[PDB]
Design a protein around this ligand. Structure first.
Ligand code: SF4
Ligand code: SF4
Ligand SMILES: [Zn+2]
Lengths: 109, 184, 72, 126, 181, 71, 382
């Protein structure tokens, strides 16, 4: 064919976008040839139901509060002391200028 | 389990004059401060060479119609360099001119206009321009717990009498409110 | 006569009540039954165990089928 | 050797005077916090870490090595951070807030509500 | 903008290494080879076949999990399915259902009025999930484009009952979804 | 409320009860392609330039012969 | 300085007003209230399972990342773990949605600039992906498929095979489109160096997503705060060198390819198991159990009447939507109705962007800037 000399149309790893019926959808979604039984529970639960131990939700600790005055503020200010390290850490990341065809010969992903 | 470092360092080096409450939860770390020093606190951040936030993500209003300080302004802002985010949450009543942050983060004019009309909280410096979201001359502030869901005057229809008009609400099939509550 | 008059309008074909009275009873053998139709799902009508210790049929409260005990 | 190619960011522009500018900025900040503000808190912190970074840059003297050892993104980014910190110090002393007068409550709140592992949480940088 | 002058020089000092490179790049930008490549690709697609589903004679593909014109099924005995739980009305996120019941004469409970003003009924699906007897369902019919608002205010269960004209088709769907739902 | 619903037929315990048939077949279907690839196989520089120049010269010679005939 | 108006392709409803000077846009300013609904007010006077469709309606191009973000917020606030198959299919569909949005935004940009054939080819591909949606659950768009705690229904059989077929043919289609646009001198001269954004003002104006990743700074939430299975799904995360229209465009295409890598990595690891829960107190029971057991009916009834109750605290949850950091702020208290659910769509940041970054350009460049910003007034206004 006359184009077929440059571009994706002249590449053995090139596919078109007209999937035939048989090759795209040969089994309609309604009447499949199988019988799926989706799971919905684990055996341990289904024969040892115990809802608090399962529902660690609402099993959270209570909210703890404290007030501070000038005395405690001064005490903390004095006992506190920084260090050359562990101030915070830094989240550093930079560009690399990587290729495209590298990963898995440029295939796998 | 996310950003204890930045929060701890920020609290242990701050001028402790302007912090009213600190909550180091796991949902989000909160510096509840006084409305008088808000600009001072935010300008401390974004500049200190460890807890530099440099990006303001949200300025949202919350309404509590049962407390003397009716409103609650909330600033959610992260630190793209130190991979952390904090939530500075201030109180605010009816009319009480709150400081602006459009000088520091220019990305607050639209969020401060939105909190001007949705709620009614003011803003002393520049960002309190006219309303943004709601259409035009609007009676109330349509996100507190008083402006009803269907609005005061909202019928708006064409009139071959003249052209088009806005008239008070007479809607059909009134809003049903189901209860669903559960006394345990 | 009044319910079907409130909702239905045509009054040419028979109303649901008329059809469910046209279906006869079942005449089951034991003392307790369960009404769904013929499938457990895809036909709804959750299990509705109904007693049969009266000389008159017993309705099912979904898709009234009027089961009846056979013998004495 | 290996002056630089590009810092990678659009706003920052490379500068071959990284060591000299850092030396000057750090000396100035050390002087400012040394004389001006009260000896507390913020001042303690900034004195400590700023004199640290001054010492390490002065000793390493090769901008590649100062990056690799000091452990921060770029010398340009450090220049930006130092300039901003000095600006902040100026503002701070303009409105000096130090010292809690009295009648002061800072409610420390904490609740250890557990959250699942499949929720967006900014996991700590190693 | 002083750096841009310096950058534009190096960028020219880099690509213009030899004479072959400058000559190639020049007649590249002078004979429109990328234009020609684009044109050839376009012409290929022109010669190639089309999609153009030709609607009124061969409609598009669907799935049994579709949502459309609602319907109220009924048992094989002709007996209605709905029992007035109010669950569909309760879960309606658009409040687009109105339902009002009463004890019938024979004893069973049924619905005196049941209507869905189809517009206000965005088609979300929660209907066919809240129903404990599969009374209401969304049959795979999307061609109902009346010319007067009142129609799309589907009537007091009457037209909804007429959804049984699909009772075969709908049934099929339900079977294929009894497994995983 | 799960045993026979999930699978009644013949299991001795709750484990190894169901058959699922949900996901992919054994093998991941393929290794797929994601990287771009546009081959450049057209006549690059000298071919096209010589074509243009040669056809121009020869066309001019033909124009000459034709104008001779027409005169 | 002229005062021109701009009330326009169908690239949304928006009212630009432009202080002009010759052919220079001295000051552009958008009026945005032109499509408002009160989504927050409604959510409040609504619920959790009832308010999910609202999130489906916000940012109506990428129609599932929103539900994903809302579900993450509710789970975080609720402490309700989710099974592995649910996580995997949820990531699969989030990435399909990213591809959808990228096709639409990219080729609508191409139409604004003038091309049309890329628009039509991309719309064919969008038809294929929408068919995937409507096969899995619901209509083509607006598939309320990601509930709190997992998904609503399991996916059918053969869907994975179709996914693979689409993956291959779609790699080829992206290659075609990139060959059609990337390199065409018209497109290059129309796109490059149009709307530069230094990272300083980027972080200032609070951009996110591709925008923030355009100029320099490399930061996306999938790598920073990996909410879901994303770890096991290594990918690439491209980054642009000089923030402008062309580099944002190339970023978009590379993001398409990385999304393909993820969409293949899932159907090779998807751990066939259960979905959506293990407590019939936060997720309703399926039909067989509901119609056979007894307590299953009680829980189904209560869960579809009043929904689940979540405790007192308030949270913020962010997701790397196709546009940017889609944020949700929940202030729930006690009862089953979400107190003050606040949205943080990136539309606000991107429009203020438009304002400042549309100076000293021409009107064609204003159109180009809207294209590269990929605005959806639905989410910018909600
Ligand atoms: S849930 Fe089903 S039967 Fe019950 S009231 Fe509604 S459609 Fe009617
Ligand atoms: S389909 Fe949804 S919008 Fe329509 S009434 Fe049923 S539950 Fe509500
Ligand atoms: Zn029955």
């Amino acid at each position: 064919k006359p184009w077929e000399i440059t571009g994706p149309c002249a590449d053995p790893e090139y596919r078109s976008a007209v999937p035939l019926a048989t090759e795209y959808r040969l089994q309609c979604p309604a009447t499949t040839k199988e019988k799926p039984c989706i799971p919905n529970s684990l055996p341990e639960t289904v024969y040892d139901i115990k809802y608090f131990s399962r529902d660690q939700r609402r099993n959270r600790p209570p909210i703890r509060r404290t007030v501070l005055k000038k005395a405690d503020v001064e005490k903390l200010a004095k006992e506190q002391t920084f260090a050359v390290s562990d101030f915070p850490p830094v989240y550093l990341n930079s560009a690399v200028e990587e290729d495209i065809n590298a990963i898995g010969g440029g295939y796998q992903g | 389990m996310d950003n204890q470092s930045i929060f701890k360092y920020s609290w242990e080096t701050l001028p402790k004059k302007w912090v009213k409450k600190m909550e180091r939860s796991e949902h989000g770390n909160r510096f509840d401060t006084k409305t008088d020093y808000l600009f001072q606190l935010l300008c401390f951040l974004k500049l200190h060479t460890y807890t530099r936030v440099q990006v303001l993500i949200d300025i949202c209003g919350v309404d509590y119609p049962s407390r003397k300080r009716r409103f609650e302004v909330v600033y959610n802002l992260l630190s793209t360099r130190y991979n952390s985010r904090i939530r500075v949450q201030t109180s605010a009543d009816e009319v009480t001119r709150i400081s602006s942050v459009v000088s520091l983060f220019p990305s607050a004019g639209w969020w401060e206009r939105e909190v001007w009309d949705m709620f009614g909280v003011s803003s002393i410096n520049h960002p309190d321009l006219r309303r943004i979201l709601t259409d035009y001359g609007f009676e109330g502030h349509p996100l507190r717990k008083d402006f009803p869901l269907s609005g005061y005057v909202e019928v708006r229809y064409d009139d071959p009498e003249k052209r088009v008009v806005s008239e008070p609400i007479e809607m059909t099939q009134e809003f049903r409110y189901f209860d669903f509550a559960s006394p345990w | 006569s009044n319910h079907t008059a409130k909702w239905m309008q045509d009054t040419s074909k028979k109303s649901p009540m008329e059809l469910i009275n046209e279906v006869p009873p079942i005449k089951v053998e034991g003392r307790i039954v369960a009404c769904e139709g013929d499938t457990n799902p895809a036909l709804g009508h959750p299990i509705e165990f109904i007693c049969l210790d009266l000389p008159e049929p017993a309705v099912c409260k979904y898709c009234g089928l009027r089961y009846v005990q056979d013998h004495h | 050797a290996k002056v630089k190619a590009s810092t990678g960011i659009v706003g920052l522009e490379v500068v071959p005077n990284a060591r000299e500018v850092l030396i000057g900025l750090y000396s100035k900040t050390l002087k400012e916090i040394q004389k001006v503000p009260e000896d507390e808190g913020y001042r303690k912190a900034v004195e400590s870490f700023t004199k640290h970074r001054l010492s390490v840059c002065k000793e390493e003297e090769d901008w590649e090595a100062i990056e690799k050892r000091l452990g921060c993104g770029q010398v340009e980014e450090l220049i930006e951070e130092a300039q901003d910190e000095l600006k902040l110090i100026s503002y701070m002393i303009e409105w000096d807030p130090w010292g809690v007068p009295d009648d002061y409550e800072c409610e420390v709140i904490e609740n250890d509500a557990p959250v699942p592992k499949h929720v967006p949480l900014h996991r700590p940088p190693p | 903008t002083k750096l841009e002058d310096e950058q534009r020089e190096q960028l020219a000092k880099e690509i213009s290494k030899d004479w072959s490179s400058v000559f190639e790049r020049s007649i590249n930008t002078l004979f429109l080879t990328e234009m020609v490549r684009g044109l050839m690709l376009t012409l290929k697609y022109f010669f190639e076949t089309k999609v153009t589903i030709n609607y009124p004679f061969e409609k598009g593909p669907l799935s049994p999990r579709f949502r459309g014109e609602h319907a109220l099924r009924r048992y094989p005995t002709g007996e209605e399915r709905c029992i007035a739980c109010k669950l569909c009305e309760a879960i309606c996120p658009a409040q687009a259902i109105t339902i009002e019941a009463e004890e019938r004469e024979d004893g069973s409970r049924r619905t005196t009025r049941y209507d869905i003003d189809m517009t206000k009924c965005i088609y979300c699906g929660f209907c066919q999930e809240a129903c404990p007897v599969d009374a209401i369902v969304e049959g795979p019919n999307f061609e109902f484009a009346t010319e007067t608002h009142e129609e799309l205010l589907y009537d007091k269960e009457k037209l909804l009952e007429n959804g049984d004209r699909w009772e075969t088709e709908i049934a099929e769907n339900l079977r294929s979804e009894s497994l995983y739902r | 409320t799960e045993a026979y619903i999930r699978n009644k037929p013949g299991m001795v315990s709750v484990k190894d009860m169901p058959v699922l048939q949900d996901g992919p077949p054994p093998g991941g279907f393929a290794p797929v392609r994601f990287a771009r690839r546009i081959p450049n196989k057209g006549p690059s520089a000298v071919a096209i330039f010589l074509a243009a120049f040669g056809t121009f010269s020869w066309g001019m010679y033909q124009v000459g012969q034709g104008n001779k005939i027409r005169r | 300085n002229f005062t021109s108006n701009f009330g326009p392709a169908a690239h949304g409803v928006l009212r630009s007003v432009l202080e002009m000077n010759g052919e220079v846009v001295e000051r552009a300013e958008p009026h945005i209230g032109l499509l408002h609904r009160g989504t927050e007010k409604l959510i409040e006077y609504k619920t959790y399972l009832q308010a999910l469709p609202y999130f489906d309606r916000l940012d109506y191009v990428s129609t599932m990342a929103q539900e994903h973000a809302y579900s993450l917020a509710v789970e975080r606030l609720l402490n309700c773990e989710v099974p592995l198959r649910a996580q995997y299919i949820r990531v699969l569909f989030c990435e399909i949605t990213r591809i959808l949005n990228h096709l639409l935004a990219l080729t609508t940009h191409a139409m604004d600039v003038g091309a049309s054939t890329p628009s039509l080819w991309a719309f064919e591909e969008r038809e294929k992906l929408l068919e995937f949606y409507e096969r899995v659950s619901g209509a083509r768009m607006h598939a309320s498929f990601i509930r709190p705690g997992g998904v609503a229904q399991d996916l059918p059989l053969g869907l994975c095979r179709d996914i693979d077929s689409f993956t291959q043919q779609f790699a080829s289609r992206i290659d075609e489109l990139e060959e059609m646009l990337t390199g065409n001198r018209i497109w290059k001269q129309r796109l490059v160096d149009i709307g530069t954004v230094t990272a300083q003002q980027a972080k200032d104006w609070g951009f996110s997503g591709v925008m923030l990743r355009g100029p320099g700074v490399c930061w996306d939430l999938r790598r920073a705060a990996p909410y879901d299975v994303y770890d096991q799904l290594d990918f690439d995360v491209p980054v642009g060198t000089r923030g402008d229209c062309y580099d944002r465009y190339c970023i978009r295409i590379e993001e398409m390819r990385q999304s393909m890598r993820i969409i293949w990595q899932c159907p090779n690891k998807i751990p066939s198991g259960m979905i959506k829960a293990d407590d019939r107190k936060l997720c309703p029971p399926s039909r067989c159990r509901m119609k056979l057991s007894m307590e299953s009916s009680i829980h189904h009834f209560e869960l579809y009447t009043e929904g689940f109750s979540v405790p007192a605290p308030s949270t913020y949850t962010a997701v790397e939507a196709p546009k940017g950091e889609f944020g949700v702020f929940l202030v729930s208290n006690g009862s089953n109705r979400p107190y003050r659910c606040k949205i943080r769509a990136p539309g606000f940041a991107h429009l203020q962007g438009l304002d400042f970054m549309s100076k000293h350009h021409m009107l064609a460049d204003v159109v180009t800037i809207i294209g590269t910003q990929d605005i959806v007034s639905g989410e910018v206004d909600r």
